[PDB]
Write a protein that binds this ligand. Structure first.
Ligand SMILES: CCCCCCCCOCCOCCOCCOCCO
Ligand SMILES: CCCCCCCCOCCOCCOCCOCCO
Ligand SMILES: CCCCCCCCOCCOCCOCCOCCO
Ligand SMILES: CCCCCCCCOCCOCCOCCOCCO
Ligand SMILES: CCCCCCCCOCCOCCOCCOCCO
Ligand code: NA
Length: 656
């Protein structure tokens, strides 16, 4: 049912077993959790499952970068789309050994964002939300059956807000997503989808890190200043993105046991921004000042991805196979020409009276984003054109050997060719001039998972995955249980992942994360639902060209992470909910010389049924107004999370 906290199967056809019998850690963040937590961004939704951090807006899973392992309906994210939540059905987070997706050389760790599709139902949902942070949000979700064999769904969203506890920072976005499906209850089914999102935000890099005598024995943390402090310029800084995506998927049953599909997606994105890096390690923070160091982008990206898959059920003697095999091809072209941004207050990286007067610099303690900035912006001379092609081939099979034993096997090949060219100015990469760069690589990935079922509702598994690139290994021992006629899932795993060239920047040695993960989701009782988990991550740089890094923690990795969301149906009329998250300290670099501290955050919810068609929902996020950081960089800065926000929604819902 639609309200479940416990989804028992992936929406991806690439899974050859239900989640209970899939030998890896996988958690689906379902629609009802997204709604009940009031999550408005993918990051808000991801925090409900443990082990996810962010670095570089790239997701890190159990301590390893997962940017190239983010998928949209199972397809490679060509041209790097921005999504929100208004068109999201659910988010699948995989951590265990192996990937069902094409990640090049990935031995595990993926996010798959599942888009809303048209249902065989008639409904209309509309939401209006007001916030203490000036949130004004309107959504519409309308779904209509067309006879017995087709349907249409349309999702619309408009959203404006300030950011609680960040001076002068605002966000705005809107989106539209129509989709149609042809062929329910027929041998051939096709879906056509379109997605558009536009954003227009004040970009915010947070607070500067200190940078005096930085070392492992004297690590840099964020400056100890008001966490409301914003170092950007209202009159200069902005971030505007557009996302346009069109998808055509068709599948055909050749018989009851064999289905062929082909999916094609075309994407265009743009990203235009100017953002202020707070001092860019230029030495002014020590003296109480911040140089608003402008960074920019002005890019257009175009992409396409095509997948062709076969899925089959068949028997070889007593063994039952569920098999999926396919090919993926993609192409992406990116053109970027950053701006040339010139100081209004003369030369140099060191704050002085001229640069304070021009708005190029400001006070560390009391920055004034309203400053009138007297610099200039033009198109820069430097530009880059980057073309990336990928190919992948894969076969996955779950072999049921008996009622108690299953073997999962997978093999994938991936290849990658990336070509960049353009013009560079004099700096890091050499003298000014034209450049051309190519890299081409391939990987074989192997996965094996043995599953024992001591009872129908239980699994014990041992799995491993390795990747070769002409010794990345991921290993996991785990158990999964389903209780109360599949209303509650409980999961536990012990794992170790080794990489030699973890990432971007590539290390030359060995990195290891090992630990334990617990997961729980579903109903404790008829009225009481839970969702969350716990992970302990022991990370280590085992070998490095920088000797002093050996033994250090991996960056972007919290040793402990606890997250719990729960709701209780107090009355037939009234539901309450609450959330608790703990994230341990994170280092920003392999030297462990930058960091942000641990924190606890608490959230609350109440929902009142006004009528059968109208709910009133209150969400209070970060109810103690804890001021914490949700990203640390290897240098320069740390990102400040929002303070307390209260959101009140009126949610209308009408069904046939
Ligand atoms: C200067 C940039 C223009 C921004 C305002 C345009 C807003 C577009 O309206 C949304 C279109 O909605 C169509 C879907 O229905
Ligand atoms: C499509 C134009 C791209 C260049 C935009 C750069 C300037 C940003 O907006 C200019 C107009 O701003 C009007 C007021 O906007 C208030 C909120 O601004 C947030 C970031 O734009
Ligand atoms: C070859 C692959 C790329 C082709 C993708 C085509 C995607 C077309 O999507 C159409 C989705 O359905 C649209 C129905 O029309 C809705 C218009 O909504 C207007 C809102 O007022
Ligand atoms: C190694 C990757 C390629 C392996 C593909 C094997 C898939 C073949 O499976 C065939 C499925 O069984 C076909 C049954 O044929 C009899 C038709 O019976 C009617 C079913 O209702
Ligand atoms: C070797 C790497 C290529 C992987 C291709 C996958 C092929 C799909 O698997 C189909 C299985 O059919 C083989 C027949 O298996 C017979 C097993 O039973 C014999 C013992 O009694
Ligand atoms: Na603006």
């Amino acid at each position: 049912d639609e309200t479940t906290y416990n989804v028992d199967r992936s929406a991806s056809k690439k899974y050859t077993a239900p989640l209970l019998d899939t030998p890896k850690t996988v958690t689906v963040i379902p629609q009802q959790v997204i709604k009940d937590t009031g999550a408005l961004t993918l990051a808000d939704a991801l925090r409900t499952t443990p082990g996810i951090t962010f670095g570089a807006d790239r997701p890190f899973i159990r301590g390893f970068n997962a940017e190239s392992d983010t998928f949209l309906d199972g397809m490679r994210d060509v041209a790097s789309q921005t999504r929100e939540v208004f068109n999201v059905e659910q988010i699948e987070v995989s951590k265990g050994p192996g990937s069902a997706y094409t990640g090049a050389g990935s031995t595990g760790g993926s996010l798959n964002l599942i888009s809303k599709t048209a249902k065989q139902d008639n409904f209309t949902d509309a939401g209006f939300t007001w916030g203490s942070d000036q949130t004004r949000r309107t959504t519409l979700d309308v779904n209509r059956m067309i006879g017995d064999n087709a349907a249409f769904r349309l999702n619309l969203m408009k959203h404006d807000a300030h950011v609680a506890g960040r001076d002068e920072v605002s966000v705005s976005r809107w989106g539209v997503a129509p989709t149609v499906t042809f062929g329910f209850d027929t041998p051939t089914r096709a879906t056509l989808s379109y997605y558009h999102l536009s954003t227009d935000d004040m970009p915010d890099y947070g607070l500067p890190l200190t940078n005096v005598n930085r070392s492992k024995a004297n690590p840099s943390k964020p400056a100890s200043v008001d966490r409301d402090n914003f170092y950007g310029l209202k009159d200069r800084d902005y971030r505007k993105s557009t996302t346009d995506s069109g998808t055509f998927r068709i599948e055909h049953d050749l018989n009851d046991n064999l289905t062929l599909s082909n999916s094609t997606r075309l994407v265009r994105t743009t990203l235009d921004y100017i953002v202020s890096n707070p001092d860019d390690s230029r030495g002014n923070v020590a003296n109480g000042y911040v140089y608003r160091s402008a960074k920019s982008r002005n890019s257009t990206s175009k992409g396409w991805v095509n997948q062709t898959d076969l899925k089959a059920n068949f028997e070889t003697g007593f063994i039952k196979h569920t098999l999926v095999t396919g090919l993926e091809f993609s192409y992406e072209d990116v053109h970027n020409r950053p701006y040339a941004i010139t100081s209004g207050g003369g030369a140099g990286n060191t704050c002085n009276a001229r640069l304070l007067a021009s708005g190029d610099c400001t006070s560390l303690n009391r920055p004034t984003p309203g400053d009138n900035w007297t610099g200039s912006i033009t198109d820069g001379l430097a530009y880059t054109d980057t073309d990336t092609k990928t190919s992948a081939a894969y076969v996955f099979d779950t072999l049921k050997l008996s009622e108690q034993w299953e073997l999962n096997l997978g093999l994938r090949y991936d290849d990658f060719d990336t070509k960049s060219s353009g013009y560079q100015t004099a700096g890091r990469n050499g003298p000014a001039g034209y450049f051309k760069r190519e890299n081409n690589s391939h990987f074989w990935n192997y996965q094996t998972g043995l599953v024992y079922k001591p009872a129908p509702n239980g699994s014990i598994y041992l799995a491993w995955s390795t990747s070769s690139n002409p010794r990345n290994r991921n290993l996991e021992l785990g158990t999964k249980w389903a209780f109360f006629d599949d209303a509650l899932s409980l999961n536990a795993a012990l794992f170790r992942t080794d990489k030699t060239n973890a990432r971007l920047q590539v290390l030359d040695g060995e990195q290891r994360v090992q630990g334990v993960e617990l997961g729980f989701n579903g109903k404790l009782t008829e009225k009481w639902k839970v969702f969350g988990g716990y992970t302990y991550l022991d990370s280590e740089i085992r070998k490095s060209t920088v000797k002093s890094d050996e033994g250090n923690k991996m960056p972007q990795t919290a040793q402990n992470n606890f997250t719990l969301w729960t709701t209780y149906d107090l009355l037939q009329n009234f539901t309450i909910g609450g959330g608790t998250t703990y994230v341990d300290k994170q280092y920003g670099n392999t030297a462990n010389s930058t960091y942000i501290p641990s924190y606890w955050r608490y959230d609350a919810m109440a929902s009142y049924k006004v009528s059968k068609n109208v709910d009133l929902q209150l969400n209070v996020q970060n109810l103690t107004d804890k001021r914490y950081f949700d990203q640390v960089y290897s240098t320069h800065m740390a990102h400040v999370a929002p303070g307390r926000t209260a959101l009140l929604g009126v949610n209308f819902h009408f069904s046939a």
